[PDB]
Amino acid sequence: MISLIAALAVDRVIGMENAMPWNLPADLAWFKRNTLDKPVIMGRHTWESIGRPLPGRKNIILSSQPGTDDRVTWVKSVDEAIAACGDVPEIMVIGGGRVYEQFLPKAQKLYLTHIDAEVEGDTHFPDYEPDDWESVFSEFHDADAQNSHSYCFEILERR
Numbered sequence: 001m002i003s004l005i006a007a008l009a010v011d012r013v014i015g016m017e018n019a020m021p022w023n024l025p026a027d028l029a030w031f032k033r034n035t036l037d038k039p040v041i042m043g044r045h046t047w048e049s050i051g052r053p054l055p056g057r058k059n060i061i062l063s064s065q066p067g068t069d070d071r072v073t074w075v076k077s078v079d080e081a082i083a084a085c086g087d088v089p090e091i092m093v094i095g096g097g098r099v100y101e102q103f104l105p106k107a108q109k110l111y112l113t114h115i116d117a118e119v120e121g122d123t124h125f126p127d128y129e130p131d132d133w134e135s136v137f138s139e140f141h142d143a144d145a146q147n148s149h150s151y152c153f154e155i156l157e158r159r
């Protein structure tokens, strides 16, 4: 199945100038745990910001243009990105904004980190219909010495 995984601050803001503003190591550990040993699909902008492939995951990059790095799998359409994953139990869509938008209708699961942070952003997570999704997991955490914001990991499944 297709899943999207994203970290959302106030107003569904996901990014600004191709970087996540906030410092949330607990979200980095949640992201790693839910993505490890699964193919990851990302947009070209997200690919450039990471610099190196995510290890122990097949890295699929969405770009209209020819690929510029042989360490990753390059595709030119949503359907090509899915087909390049082959037969796997779950496909992780990691962003960014435009990629989330396109994969949302095809997705069965959403792994959302809701961050209680006011951030200026130029990129937002899609405006998903809440009636279409069922929250099956929801774990709130207060801010601590390592995480400067309170945050909630949520798992939603398409009804």
Ligand SMILES: Nc1nc(N)c2c(Sc3ccc(Cl)cc3)cccc2n1
Pocket: 005, 006, 007, 014, 015, 020, 027, 028, 030, 031, 046, 094, 095, 096, 097, 100, 113
């Ligand atoms: N919970 C969560 N979700 C992601 N998708 C993460 C990523 S990669 C990424 C960032 C923004 C967007 Cl839109 C997509 C992927 C990196 C580091 C931590 C991340 N944490």
Ligand SMILES: [Ca+2]
Pocket: 055, 056, 057
């Ligand atoms: Ca490995």
Ligand SMILES: [Ca+2]
Pocket: 105
């Ligand atoms: Ca739909």
Ligand SMILES: [Ca+2]
Pocket: 116, 117, 118, 148, 149, 150
């Ligand atoms: Ca805060």
